[PDB]
Amino acid sequence: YEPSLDNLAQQDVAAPGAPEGVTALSDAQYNEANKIYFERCAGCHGVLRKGATGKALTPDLTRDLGFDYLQSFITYASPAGMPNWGTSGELSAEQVDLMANYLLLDPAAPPEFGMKEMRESWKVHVAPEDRPTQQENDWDLENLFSVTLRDAGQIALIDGSTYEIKTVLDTGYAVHISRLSASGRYLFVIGRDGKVNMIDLWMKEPTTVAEIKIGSEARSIETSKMEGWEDKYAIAGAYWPPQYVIMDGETLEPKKIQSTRGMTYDEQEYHPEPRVAAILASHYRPEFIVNVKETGKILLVDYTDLNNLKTTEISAERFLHDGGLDGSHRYFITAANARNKLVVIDTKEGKLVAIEDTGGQTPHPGRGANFVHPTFGPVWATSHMGDDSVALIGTDPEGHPDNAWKILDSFPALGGGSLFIKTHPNSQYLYVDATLNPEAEISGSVAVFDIKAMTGDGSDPEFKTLPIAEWAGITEGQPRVVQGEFNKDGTEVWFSVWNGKDQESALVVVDDKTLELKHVIKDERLVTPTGKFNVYNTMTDTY
Amino acid sequence: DVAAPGAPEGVTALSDAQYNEANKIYFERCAGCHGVLRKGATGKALTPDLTRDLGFDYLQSFITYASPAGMPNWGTSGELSAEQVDLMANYLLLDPAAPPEFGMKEMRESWKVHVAPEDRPTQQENDWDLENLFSVTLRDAGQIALIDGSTYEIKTVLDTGYAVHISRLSASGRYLFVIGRDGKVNMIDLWMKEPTTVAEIKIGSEARSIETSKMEGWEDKYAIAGAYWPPQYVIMDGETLEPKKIQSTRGMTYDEQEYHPEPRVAAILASHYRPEFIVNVKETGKILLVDYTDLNNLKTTEISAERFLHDGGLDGSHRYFITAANARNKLVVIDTKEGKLVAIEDTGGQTPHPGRGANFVHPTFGPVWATSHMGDDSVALIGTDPEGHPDNAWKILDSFPALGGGSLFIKTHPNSQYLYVDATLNPEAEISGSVAVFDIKAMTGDGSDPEFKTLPIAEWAGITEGQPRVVQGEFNKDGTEVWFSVWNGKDQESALVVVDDKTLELKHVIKDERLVTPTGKFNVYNTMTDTY
Numbered sequence A: 001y002e003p004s005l006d007n008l009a010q011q012d013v014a015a016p017g018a019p020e021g022v023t024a025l026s027d028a029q030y031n032e033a034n035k036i037y038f039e040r041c042a043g044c045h046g047v048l049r050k051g052a053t054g055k056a057l058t059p060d061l062t063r064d065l066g067f068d069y070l071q072s073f074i075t076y077a078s079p080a081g082m083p084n085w086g087t088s089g090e091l092s093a094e095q096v097d098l099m100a101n102y103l104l105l106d107p108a109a110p111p112e113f114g115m116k117e118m119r120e121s122w123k124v125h126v127a128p129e130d131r132p133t134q135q136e137n138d139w140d141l142e143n144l145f146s147v148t149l150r151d152a153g154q155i156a157l158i159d160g161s162t163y164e165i166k167t168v169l170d171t172g173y174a175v176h177i178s179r180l181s182a183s184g185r186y187l188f189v190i191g192r193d194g195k196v197n198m199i200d201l202w203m204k205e206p207t208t209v210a211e212i213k214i215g216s217e218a219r220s221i222e223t224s225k226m227e228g229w230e231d232k233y234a235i236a237g238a239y240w241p242p243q244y245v246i247m248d249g250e251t252l253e254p255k256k257i258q259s260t261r262g263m264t265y266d267e268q269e270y271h272p273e274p275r276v277a278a279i280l281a282s283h284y285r286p287e288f289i290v291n292v293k294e295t296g297k298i299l300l301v302d303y304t305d306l307n308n309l310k311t312t313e314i315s316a317e318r319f320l321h322d323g324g325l326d327g328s329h330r331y332f333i334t335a336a337n338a339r340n341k342l343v344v345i346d347t348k349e350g351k352l353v354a355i356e357d358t359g360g361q362t363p364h365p366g367r368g369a370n371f372v373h374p375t376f377g378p379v380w381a382t383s384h385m386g387d388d389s390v391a392l393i394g395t396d397p398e399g400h401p402d403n404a405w406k407i408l409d410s411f412p413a414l415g416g417g418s419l420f421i422k423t424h425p426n427s428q429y430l431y432v433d434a435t436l437n438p439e440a441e442i443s444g445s446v447a448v449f450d451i452k453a454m455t456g457d458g459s460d461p462e463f464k465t466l467p468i469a470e471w472a473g474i475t476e477g478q479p480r481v482v483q484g485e486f487n488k489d490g491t492e493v494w495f496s497v498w499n500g501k502d503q504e505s506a507l508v509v510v511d512d513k514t515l516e517l518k519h520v521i522k523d524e525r526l527v528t529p530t531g532k533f534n535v536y537n538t539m540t541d542t543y
Numbered sequence B: 001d002v003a004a005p006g007a008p009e010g011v012t013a014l015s016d017a018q019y020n021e022a023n024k025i026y027f028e029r030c031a032g033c034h035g036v037l038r039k040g041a042t043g044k045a046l047t048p049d050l051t052r053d054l055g056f057d058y059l060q061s062f063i064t065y066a067s068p069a070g071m072p073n074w075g076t077s078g079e080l081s082a083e084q085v086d087l088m089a090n091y092l093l094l095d096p097a098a099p100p101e102f103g104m105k106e107m108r109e110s111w112k113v114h115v116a117p118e119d120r121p122t123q124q125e126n127d128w129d130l131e132n133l134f135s136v137t138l139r140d141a142g143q144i145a146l147i148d149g150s151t152y153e154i155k156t157v158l159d160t161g162y163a164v165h166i167s168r169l170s171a172s173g174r175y176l177f178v179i180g181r182d183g184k185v186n187m188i189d190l191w192m193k194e195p196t197t198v199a200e201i202k203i204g205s206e207a208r209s210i211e212t213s214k215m216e217g218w219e220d221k222y223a224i225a226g227a228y229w230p231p232q233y234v235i236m237d238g239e240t241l242e243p244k245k246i247q248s249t250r251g252m253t254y255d256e257q258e259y260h261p262e263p264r265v266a267a268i269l270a271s272h273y274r275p276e277f278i279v280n281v282k283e284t285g286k287i288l289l290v291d292y293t294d295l296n297n298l299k300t301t302e303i304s305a306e307r308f309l310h311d312g313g314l315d316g317s318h319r320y321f322i323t324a325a326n327a328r329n330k331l332v333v334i335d336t337k338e339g340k341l342v343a344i345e346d347t348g349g350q351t352p353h354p355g356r357g358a359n360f361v362h363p364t365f366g367p368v369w370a371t372s373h374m375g376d377d378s379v380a381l382i383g384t385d386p387e388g389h390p391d392n393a394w395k396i397l398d399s400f401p402a403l404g405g406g407s408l409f410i411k412t413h414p415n416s417q418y419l420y421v422d423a424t425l426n427p428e429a430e431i432s433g434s435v436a437v438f439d440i441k442a443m444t445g446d447g448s449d450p451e452f453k454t455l456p457i458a459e460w461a462g463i464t465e466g467q468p469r470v471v472q473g474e475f476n477k478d479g480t481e482v483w484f485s486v487w488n489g490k491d492q493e494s495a496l497v498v499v500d501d502k503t504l505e506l507k508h509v510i511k512d513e514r515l516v517t518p519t520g521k522f523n524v525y526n527t528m529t530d531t532y
């Protein structure tokens, strides 16, 4: 579950000459190898080949290893996490050789993307002046769902009560997630290619009113959520170049670009490629909360003054990915996934308050799930990609002191490969998917725990299994169920039945009160549906 | 060693052996002017996209015969053999070499504590008058001399890093910190019977600045060093030099907002209003206010200022930082209390170079801070009193000529009625060997050029051999005497000249075989208190 940097692998490059002891590749061969590198290798080895999950592959190292070593490693791989590209057939014998030779050659230098480039890509389709002054359509905007139709580079706006696909909008490239302005009027989508689209939900026919490119590869975006700063700013984070950008919340005008290149928090060594992961917005101060993966830093960026920029660079833990605020919206709890830790930041005081091991392998909470456990009090939960465990952490320093920032319980759900856990204040249920599980029976189902039945005795809570994929009537292909998302009232929860692009997918709506199938959304346009975001729950951070 | 890059169409490739040889030469001799990443600085950019258009022949010839503007004639001089020149020519046509970083591992490896705090004196054990002591850089000797400010006796000569750039004092005045251009930092305990280096550390490959914590309540808590390469600053324990926090300065330019791979750290001062360090980041034009109360949850204010920030100083009230964005002829003013940019004004002169500048009360204008220039003979005054003189605040109030161009340091003291201005880099020996002195009391600010007395400093030193350059005035603790360095070559005769401030007459000439290439001089009291 590492990033595929496809957009970077669409950029043609100049083939470098070969130095002493190295064979050269033609521009054709080199570009072929370059495409493969960014599409399949850069996620683990880095855009600059400096290393991340995988070891560094820079010439100073690879040339010492030699062609044979590289060829063998790419072909047979290793048990530590390196895929057997050759023996699996993923890469042909010729491609394997291209990659081995490619690794011996000077690394390609992907371009930077500064203000000049951003402003050039900046397009305002409808100036604020010309936009509606009130909602012109009759949609129940707060109950609307924005769904990522992954491979189609589109998003579907679906009605939360009728399940009608109101419209399908194009962005031109695969979108990762949707976020809403604090007023709920503007819908922001971040494309994997670094393209940001801003949609005005007040239009009779909602569409993009402004767009801008902020980098080459990106996965995160957020809006200003401090009271008084509604609709003032939007922020986007990139994998490449390593930077985040604060934009005007009404026009997308790029205001401030900040490089994330810097020192790792622990060994304090310079890191040339620190990717920006999750970005949240503080409700206690006019700040954005930015996760910087490889350096293990969480940045609290004050947007009240972009010229005299105040920031708090918090030393956390390396490999930060996703996370969410607790129920009170004061503490940011995030997964430093590779190290199995949850880092807790007090957004009011701007300081790290705890780092706890979950006892599980690779926690992946999404924004997590907050609920008042019957005996433990307020807790935040996360499931794991590496195993079947669900861990609960106390989130009430003042009210449940001894339980605060301590892993209170850990129990199994359906199986490993989980990606998202979900609940809502109006629900007594905790839903846990198992998207990446190798067993179709598991990956196509969801575990549901009854919060009301949770005692605090150490025994593993029972769960009901919902056959989501089966309910959708989809057996063809590899239909993986992913991410629960509630409607505005918290009475229904949606799940994506993510199938291949040339296969049938669906969205399944579950009645939260009965845990029975409510409705199945199917449409020829529903290609590879993944992330779903309810307007109200996203604008208010209700999870 | 670095992995040799391949050569593209038409251009020749070098073996790993050849390349690394040329690489060594580049970083040791060229990187200083052309930049570590070949992006350019004092010299033009030598990146492939430019060099290839020029061609091998152009590069070769330029490296051999050089040019008037500043390029050294490596070939003709013999500094580089014909082979080395060609090697450099081919080298310049190839992709830029990947420079070595210098992080925590490297710093801790160089970190040595010679005398642990617990083994140091608990009170001053020598009988020196520490506050009136002067720490003088003996540049080419890799030493500093501690000189008695009243008797002019050289109390001790200590080994330090090569070409120490400056000396800074801890707020209590007990600890002396020096940093060499190489990145080597030495911490000296002035309370020892025989003061010496109690701790040392290397913070980079090229460095110029070091400073101590000066916020009340934070005396002797921290020291901070800035590096040209790698682009970073490091906060160290004020008692042991333990490297606590390293921050990269690589980032975006304030105006065009474009990534810059080499933003060198220039001057670093310490706030008197908040527990913060004031860090100038040259190429990006950013001034950083770094809060040292919490190094884990690090608070900083990144102030967009002006590009090419170099040196500067606090006004008389110690609230406003006034710094020169030298290449753009601007003075940037930061309010250290509110943590914000207050003004940016053009001095009307070419390349302002204030050092820490000179604060004084102008008879007509009120509180002002002055700076002279490297590019011309002008002295500019900026108002520094928003409350008492609002109409004059942050405005260039006057500009008048001194001895000539090539000035580096301007100086005065609260007890002095004089404003001293050197002309160190002037090509004319008679000018570079003298200092201009203006009578502040006589300044009217009527638009006329104030008269100045010319002190023949070099002549007073009795040195004519090899054109000595007079540089940097520095006062004693009482502000009654001002010292100047008479800087001659390593194998030549140098001296320090002490001037009686009240009469502007020669007070004393300091000569000693050990006084090799004297440059910066720092009085303990005036440095610990930022009195200028």
Ligand code: DHE
Residues within 6 Å of the ligand: A001, A002, A003, A004, A005, A148, A150, A175, A176, A177, A219, A220, A221, A222, A276, A277, A278, A279, A280, A321, A322, A366, A367, A419, A482, A483, A530, A531, A532
């Ligand atoms: C940085 C980041 C965020 C936080 C966004 C924010 O805070 O606004 C995020 C969130 C998310 C969220 C947020 C859910 C939420 O409720 O907040 C979802 C649904 C999601 C669906 C997927 N993500 Fe995501 N995702 C990455 C990156 C990220 N994903 C990757 O790098 C990775 C591992 C590989 C890649 O090539 O992108 C990856 C793969 C996936 C998927 O395979 C998913 C399941 C399907 C898809 O569309 O690609 N990502």
Ligand code: DHE
Residues within 6 Å of the ligand: B139, B163, B164, B165, B166, B181, B208, B209, B210, B211, B265, B266, B267, B268, B269, B310, B311, B355, B356, B471, B472, B519, B520, B521
């Ligand atoms: C960044 C910087 C500072 C601020 C330090 C601080 O805040 O602690 C500084 C200050 C200084 C100060 C500060 C004086 C003061 O009163 O604060 C002095 C004496 C000084 C002696 C010299 N400087 Fe300096 N100096 C540079 C850099 C700097 N010099 C250069 O990059 C430059 C232009 C080129 C070089 O070759 O290093 C340069 C040339 C010189 C000289 O020629 C001097 C005269 C002698 C030498 O050894 O290089 N620099």
Ligand code: HEC
Residues within 6 Å of the ligand: A001, A002, A036, A037, A040, A041, A042, A043, A044, A045, A053, A054, A055, A056, A057, A065, A069, A070, A073, A074, A078, A079, A080, A081, A082, A083, A085, A091, A099, A100, A103
């Ligand atoms: C993350 C899932 C990876 C992807 C995708 C790719 N590689 Fe990898 N690689 C990864 C790991 C964790 C390791 C180390 C495994 C170990 O036993 O320690 C590696 C290693 C390599 C190597 C050898 C490096 C060395 O031993 O110094 C090579 C040559 C290599 N990987 C190449 C490579 C290429 C070309 C890939 C794209 C086709 C690729 N890897 C993908 C993890 C991951």
Ligand code: HEC
Residues within 6 Å of the ligand: B025, B026, B029, B030, B031, B032, B033, B034, B042, B043, B044, B045, B046, B054, B058, B059, B060, B062, B063, B067, B068, B069, B070, B071, B072, B074, B080, B088, B092
């Ligand atoms: C600072 C004192 C310098 C050092 C040390 C080196 N160079 Fe330089 N170089 C410098 C200047 C100011 C200039 C421009 C001079 C002018 O007449 O305008 C240059 C120029 C060059 C060039 C030509 C660039 C061009 O015309 O586009 C080359 C090829 C060059 N310098 C190479 C070079 C090398 C290899 C050096 C180390 C041996 C070196 N320079 C040192 C200033 C300085």
Ligand SMILES: [C-]#N
Residues within 6 Å of the ligand: A322
């Ligand atoms: C996505 N995680």
Ligand SMILES: [C-]#N
Residues within 6 Å of the ligand: B311
């Ligand atoms: C020195 N300047």
